[PDB]
Design a protein around this ligand. Structure first.
Ligand SMILES: O=c1c(-c2ccc(O)cc2)coc2cc(O)cc(O)c12
Ligand SMILES: O=c1c(-c2ccc(O)cc2)coc2cc(O)cc(O)c12
Lengths: 235, 9, 230, 10
């Protein structure tokens, strides 16, 4: 239970260290955006990020203290929320665009390539603007990503998880106190950040039913990893 | 389950 | 706007005062679905009356109010459900004459999964000993937050939402929680709102599958509530 | 028009 001993600064340092890299898509220009090709690009990218996610999780303090079964359940619940908050974050300096990868910068117009995708792109773009408005910092972003992981399926064992969650809240508050925010302003900012998580949950649920829909339309073959995560949100 | 195997490694 | 000048005590009073009534219910998969949707449809009319009593809401343009309501309606109904189910462990008090357990959920395809979540959430408010003043704060947060991003009108909502944060903290302080306990509890409460979003989304897609299998006839308002989501 | 729109203007 040694994650419960870290200072606020050790926690931030630990999460910043565990950050996965930004990956490249296999976008090929000489190949107009179809529904299949873009669905192909997005899901290929998700597949590859998934392996980096699994390993990052193992490095969120307190995550390995849970049984393999709980760990599985949390990543199954959280995986698209995590990819999405990742995307939103990367997309912050690109107003009106989603930077899925350095070589895949999309705007709301090409969400249209895929039925129902545009409503999702708009939600993602709206969350990116919010981050930008609030001037979300990297240290905050990594705390939020760890909360998504531990929160989104927290169902002793889930008291340990609630101890770890409290530790991360403490860490966000520490970060804001450090930034020179008044107590009042600290509470307000903390609530603004955690209320974003509700929108990210919404987007994940929307993306998961879109994803499931795309598989029934046979738009693209999906990874065995991806098929498993998808069948976890439906049984 | 593929995830199960990946967490193990 | 006068919403922003309310003290915390006045915010809590206005909220408690605007609370909607508890309605009564009016067993096949079809009949049970009929009950649940008939209830929701009647509650919807009262929710709308409540929304208008939420400080700040009336300040929004009618189109923003519609957007917020369309986004949040089922989240609002479910948090109410989970609140009134609190002192009924293992049961969901849809109405005082409709108190259902997980066994009654198995009657409808896909519904027990939703019941089990609503039940876990109710158990969570119970372990946390969520107080009524806290509840009304959370419910109004859902109303103002759920559709907010997908919109200086936002700015106003966010000020109003900041005011609600303050009120929540004040209640915790007054109650005697430590300053650390305050931010810890605020976070725990807000995190539960993401579980409520999750549940609304599952309930929403479930309702849509009930509609498409022709299991229950839905009112014109419910059909419209559901269209906003696809 | 929308029932919701309508219910709100009462
Ligand atoms: O957004 C995504 C992503 C995705 C991939 C990588 C990221 O970094 C972020 C999102 C993957 O598959 C989908 C599949 C869908 O059907 C709809 C979606 O919105 C997505
Ligand atoms: O939970 C509900 C409710 C419901 C009704 C009244 C309340 O106070 C709360 C939820 C209504 O319709 C549904 C319809 C569904 O398909 C699934 C559901 O879970 C529900």
């Amino acid at each position: 239970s040694l994650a419960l001993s870290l200072t606020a600064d050790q926690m931030v340092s630990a999460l910043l260290d565990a950050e996965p890299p930004i990956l490249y898509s296999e976008y090929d220009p000489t190949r107009p955006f179809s529904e299949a090709s873009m669905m192909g690009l997005l899901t290929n990218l998700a597949d590859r990020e998934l392996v980096h996610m699994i390993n990052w999780a193992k490095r969120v303090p307190g995550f390995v203290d849970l049984t393999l079964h709980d760990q599985v359940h949390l990543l199954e619940c959280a995986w698209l929320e995590i990819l999405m908050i990742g995307l939103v974050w990367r997309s912050m300096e690109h107003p009106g665009k989603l930077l899925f990868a350095p070589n895949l910068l999309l705007d709301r117009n090409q969400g249209k390539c895929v039925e129902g995708m545009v409503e999702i792109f708009d939600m993602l773009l709206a969350t990116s603007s919010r981050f930008r408005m609030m001037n979300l910092q990297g240290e905050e972003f990594v705390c939020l990503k760890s909360i998504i992981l531990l929160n989104s399926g927290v169902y002793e064992e889930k008291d340990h998880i609630h101890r770890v969650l409290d530790k991360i809240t403490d860490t966000l508050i520490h970060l804001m106190a450090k930034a020179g925010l008044t107590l009042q302003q600290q509470h307000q900012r903390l609530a603004q950040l955690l209320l974003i998580l509700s929108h990210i949950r919404h987007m994940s649920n929307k993306g998961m039913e879109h994803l499931y829909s795309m598989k029934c339309k046979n738009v693209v073959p999906l990874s065995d990893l991806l098929l498993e995560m998808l069948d976890a949100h439906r049984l | 389950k593929i995830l199960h195997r990946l967490l193990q490694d």
